[PDB]
């Protein structure tokens, strides 16, 4: 859990001569610093 | 109350049974002098709004109705909860005409013609 997620497909490698080029995508780790929660009350009737 | 003819009012037969059942259900148990068991515990059953308290009420009411000797049996019909308000209804089978006839005609041997139940 140092990173959130990453798609394996995006890991592409180009090799040519003495040079190696690599592309990737990573979803950075994050930490919660806000919580918003909504509550709703409702009537109920029970029978039998 | 008065009967309108300057004499004390009287309830008979089914009216009498209504009166006695209402009075027993309304009376708290143990409050009546000389009669610890007469009454009902409904004054304490003003609990939460869940099926459990409904069942407690129902069981207490069935106990209170069964306590009467004349009530042959009682049973739940239907109940519901509307938040604050609880609502329920019961069915009471008093002793049949044949049994009452047999009892009264048997009482002729003694001549009391009165009820000390």
């Amino acid at each position: 859990n140092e990173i959130q997620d990453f798609p394996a497909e995006d890991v592409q490698v180009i090799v040519e001569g003495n040079e190696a080029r690599i592309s990737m995508t990573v979803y950075p780790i994050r930490s919660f610093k806000k919580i918003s929660v909504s509550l709703v009350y409702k009537q109920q009737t029970l029978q039998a | 109350s008065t009967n309108g003819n300057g004499d004390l009012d009287t309830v008979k037969g089914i009216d009498n049974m209504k009166q006695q059942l209402q009075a027993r259900l309304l009376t708290p148990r143990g409050s009546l002098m000389l009669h610890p068991n007469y009454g009902s515990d409904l004054h304490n059953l003003f609990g939460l709004n869940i099926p459990e308290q409904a069942t407690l009420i129902e069981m207490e009411v069935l106990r209170t109705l069964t306590s009467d000797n004349r009530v042959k049996s009682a049973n739940l019909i239907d109940w519901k909860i509307q938040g604050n308000v609880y609502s329920g209804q019961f069915s009471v089978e008093i002793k049949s005409v044949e049994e009452s006839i047999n009892f009264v005609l048997g009482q002729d041997e003694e001549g009391i013609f009165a009820l000390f139940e």
Side-chain angles (χ1 to χ4, degrees):
Chain A
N1 306 328
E2 299 186 25
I3 52 176
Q4 191 174 66
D5 193 3
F6 68 96
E9 292 183 357
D10 290 342
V11 186
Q12 296 177 4
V13 186
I14 294 166
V15 180
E16 185 178 29
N18 306 12
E19 301 194 346
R21 319 194 188 75
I22 317 186
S23 55
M24 53 177 71
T25 59
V26 175
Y27 296 102
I29 189 62
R30 213 68 148 74
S31 62
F32 293 102
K33 304 188 169 177
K34 179 171 174 189
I35 293 167
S36 281
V37 58
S38 49
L39 179 55
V40 180
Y41 292 112
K42 298 185 192 180
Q43 284 269 52
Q44 182 174 42
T45 182
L46 309 171
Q47 305 173 6
Chain B
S1 56
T2 185
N3 69 337
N5 299 116
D7 199 330
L8 292 165
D9 190 5
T10 293
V11 283
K12 316 187 298 305
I14 305 298
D15 294 338
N16 198 31
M17 293 301 311
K18 173 170 66 191
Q19 164 157 289
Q20 267 98 51
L21 290 175
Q22 285 181 352
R24 189 181 285 92
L25 287 164
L26 286 166
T27 304
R29 181 181 288 95
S31 183
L32 178 59
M33 298 290 95
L34 205 58
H35 287 118
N37 295 320
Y38 181 87
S40 49
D41 207 343
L42 304 182
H43 67 112
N44 297 329
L45 301 182
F46 281 70
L48 300 173
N49 72 341
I50 50 174
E52 182 168 9
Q53 301 291 313
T55 304
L56 289 173
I57 294 163
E58 288 288 321
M59 209 283 286
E60 185 69 43
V61 172
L62 289 166
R63 283 179 63 199
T64 305
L65 293 173
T66 309
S67 187
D68 195 337
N69 182 79
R70 304 161 193 175
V71 170
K72 184 172 186 179
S73 62
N75 62 81
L76 162 61
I77 294 294
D78 194 351
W79 67 273
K80 54 172 64 56
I81 287 165
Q82 297 172 336
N84 302 317
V85 175
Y86 183 74
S87 176
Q89 57 188 136
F90 299 80
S91 180
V92 184
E93 306 283 339
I94 56 172
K95 68 205 297 187
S96 63
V97 179
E98 175 164 33
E99 296 179 339
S100 47
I101 284 167
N102 290 324
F103 176 70
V104 175
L105 299 179
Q107 281 186 282
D108 193 65
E109 186 67 10
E110 301 295 352
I112 48 168
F113 293 94
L115 303 176
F116 304 90
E117 299 182 9

